[PDB]
Amino acid sequence: KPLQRYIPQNGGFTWPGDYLRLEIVEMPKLKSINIKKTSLKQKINVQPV
Amino acid sequence: EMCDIPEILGTVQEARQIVERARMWRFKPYGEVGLRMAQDANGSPVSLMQEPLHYPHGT
Amino acid sequence: NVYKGPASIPHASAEVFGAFFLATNTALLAHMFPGKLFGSELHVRKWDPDYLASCCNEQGMRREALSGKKPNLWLLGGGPRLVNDSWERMWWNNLHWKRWKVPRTGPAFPQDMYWQ
Amino acid sequence: LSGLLGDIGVKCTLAFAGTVAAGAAIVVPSGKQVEAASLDIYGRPPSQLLPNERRAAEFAAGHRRWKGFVDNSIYSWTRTLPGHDNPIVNP
Amino acid sequence: FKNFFSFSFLNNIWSIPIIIPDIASAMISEVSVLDGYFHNAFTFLETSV
Amino acid sequence: DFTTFEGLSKQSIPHGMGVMTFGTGTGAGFAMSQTRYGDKYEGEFQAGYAHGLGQFTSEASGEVYIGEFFAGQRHGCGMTLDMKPYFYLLERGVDPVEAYRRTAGAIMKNVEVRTWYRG
Amino acid sequence: SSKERRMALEDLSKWKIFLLNFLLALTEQSCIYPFISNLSFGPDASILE
Numbered sequence: 026k027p028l029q030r031y032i033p034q035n036g037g038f039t040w041p042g043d044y045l046r047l048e049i050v051e052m053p054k055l056k057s058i059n060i061k062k063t064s065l066k067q068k069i070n071v072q073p074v
Numbered sequence: 075e076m077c078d079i080p081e082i083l084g085t086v087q088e089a090r091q092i093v094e095r096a097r098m099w100r101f102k103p104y105g106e107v108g109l110r111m112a113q114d115a116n117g118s119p120v121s122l123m124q125e126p127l128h129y130p131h132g133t
Numbered sequence: 134n135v136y137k138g139p140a141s142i143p144h145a146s147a148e149v150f151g152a153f154f155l156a157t158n159t160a161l162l163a164h165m166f167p168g169k170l171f172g173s174e175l176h177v178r179k180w181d182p183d184y185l186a187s188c189c190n191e192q193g194m195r196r197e198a199l200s201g202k203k204p205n206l207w208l209l210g211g212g213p214r215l216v217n218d219s220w221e222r223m224w225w226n227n228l229h230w231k232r233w234k235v236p237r238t239g240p241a242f243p244q245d246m247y248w249q
Numbered sequence: 250l251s252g253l254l255g256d257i258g259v260k261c262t263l264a265f266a267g268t269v270a271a272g273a274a275i276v277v278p279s280g281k282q283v284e285a286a287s288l289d290i291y292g293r294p295p296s297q298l299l300p301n302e303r304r305a306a307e308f309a310a311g312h313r314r315w316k317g318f319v320d321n322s323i324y325s326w327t328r329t330l331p332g333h334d335n336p337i338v339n340p
Numbered sequence: 341f342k343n344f345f346s347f348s349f350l351n352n353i354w355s356i357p358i359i360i361p362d363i364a365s366a367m368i369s370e371v372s373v374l375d376g377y378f379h380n381a382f383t384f385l386e387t388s389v
Numbered sequence: 390d391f392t393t394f395e396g397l398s399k400q401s402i403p404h405g406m407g408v409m410t411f412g413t414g415t416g417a418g419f420a421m422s423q424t425r426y427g428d429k430y431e432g433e434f435q436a437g438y439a440h441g442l443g444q445f446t447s448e449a450s451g452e453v454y455i456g457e458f459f460a461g462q463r464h465g466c467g468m469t470l471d472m473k474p475y476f477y478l479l480e481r482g483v484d485p486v487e488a489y490r491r492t493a494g495a496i497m498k499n500v501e502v503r504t505w506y507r508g
Numbered sequence: 509s510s511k512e513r514r515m516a517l518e519d520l521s522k523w524k525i526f527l528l529n530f531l532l533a534l535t536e537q538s539c540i541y542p543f544i545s546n547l548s549f550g551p552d553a554s555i556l557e
């Protein structure tokens with residue numbers, strides 16, 4: 026496998042302090058109102074913490 | 075086996091040589107540490123005299 | 134004798150194309166061999182911009198100090214930005230100028246000759 | 250000169266300039282930064298704010314104006330007509 | 341465009357003053373006294389001829 | 390975390406000789422509680438570890454250690470000095486010669502020589 | 509130069525000739541034979557010090 030190299034790199038798309046907070050990650054969001062029978066269309070995978 | 079005094083003295087004598095030889099990589103002319111950590115009293119960057127061709131101010 | 138298009142629209146000769154072709158080939162050949170161009174080489178510039186900036190700053194600071202005032206240092210790229218988050222953002226312009234030192238000066242092609 | 254208007258590039262430049270002018274006319278705030286944006290987002294007068302904060306307040310005011318315009322002028326007109334069967338992708 | 345037209349770019353900053361920190365605020369770990377009579381804090385009066 | 394390293398490196402890992410200055414956090418295999426902001430280690434590095442011969446200096450506390458290191462911990466013969474009073478007088482506006490004259494004897498008397506096993 | 513315009517020189521042509529070289533002297537131009545055009549008869553590295 027190609028070897029990973031750990032060299033720090035300089036800022037891009039943001040100032041050095043922060044990271045990309047508003048990046049979209051595919052993970053379902055749960056509504057507080059109970060849904061009796063409705064598939065989430067995306068399994069939450071590993072359920073336990 | 076605990077070191078005796080002559081062994082400790084020799085170890086320190088060689089360690090000082092090692093430190094002196096290692097301290098020659100400390101101020102790379104154009105590097106991130108040199109550009110970002112060499113500052114004056116107010117914290118502003120300073121122009122270190124490390125030009126390969128220019129020796130200013132009678133140096 | 135042949136039409137060769139209207140005279141209103143400008144035409145380029147063949148001498149210019151030949152000169153361009155020969156110039157490109159000669160530039161590549163001269164860049165490949167530094168020491169063969171009549172014993173000399175080909176240089177893009179005369180003085181490095183950093184050298185000129187350092188000399189000018191030295192002279193200006195000398196003149197200001199001799200005049201009885203605290204000398205100032207002129208930065209390539211721009212001055213600071215009044216911010217309270219991080220040190221890199223405050224001095225981003227000068228750092229941006231200085232971070233291009235190697236690409237600005239050194240050539241992209243290999244300096245020496247291999248396989249010959 | 251109509252000769253300038255004949256060329257495509259001049260027409261494109263004029264259209265871009267007109268779009269920019271309309272956008273600036275409809276989104277640029279005036280007096281609403283200190284009144285609404287600045288106090289709401291920082292709770293400080295705009296003058297005391299850092300230069301990078303005043304821009305944020307102005308952007309917030311402009312975005313509020315843009316949303317107000319797009320709701321009260323375009324969407325009311327285009328939504329007075331109800332959902333017209335809402336065509337959907339069949340495949 | 342406002343900055344370009346209003347001539348407000350003449351207020352840009354290009355120069356900063358350089359102030360030498362004293363030994364108290366300097367790298368005290370580098371300062372060392374040799375023979376009890378000298379030290380490594382070098383400061384000569386520029387060029388004197 | 391503003392930890393800085395300057396020296397020889399293989400691939401992308403510190404390797405050979407160099408100087409490392411610690412900021413917030415730690416590095417070079419040292420424990421998280423050993424270092425402070427501004428401390429430095431000068432000497433041999435191997436596979437990112439402070440392995441070999443070196444010197445550890447702490448400007449905040451004054452501890453100076455010279456000697457052997459294994460992995461990221463002191464292991465072998467070493468010499469320890471506590472130059473805290475010298476730095477204390479230096480930071481209070483006293484010229485180096487006067488501070489050295491005041492605090493040379495006490496520092497010289499408290500020089501320690503030790504053998505360390507796994508720290 | 510390729511179009512080979514030839515005519516008696518007027519003041520405007522002479523000033524164009526002057527201005528071309530005046531503006532060209534302010535840019536970075538290719539130089540042959542370095543290390544000789546940079547020499548100086550003094551204890552310096554160039555003539556600008």
Ligand SMILES: CCCCCCCCCCCC
Pocket residue numbers: 266269270273341
């Ligand atoms: C050249 C394209 C832009 C020109 C018009 C500028 C629009 C903003 C003007 C604001 C005036 C208060």
Ligand SMILES: CCCCCCCCCCCC
Pocket residue numbers: 349350352
């Ligand atoms: C490129 C934008 C700034 C150009 C300014 C050039 C002249 C600066 C003079 C400053 C005098 C205080």
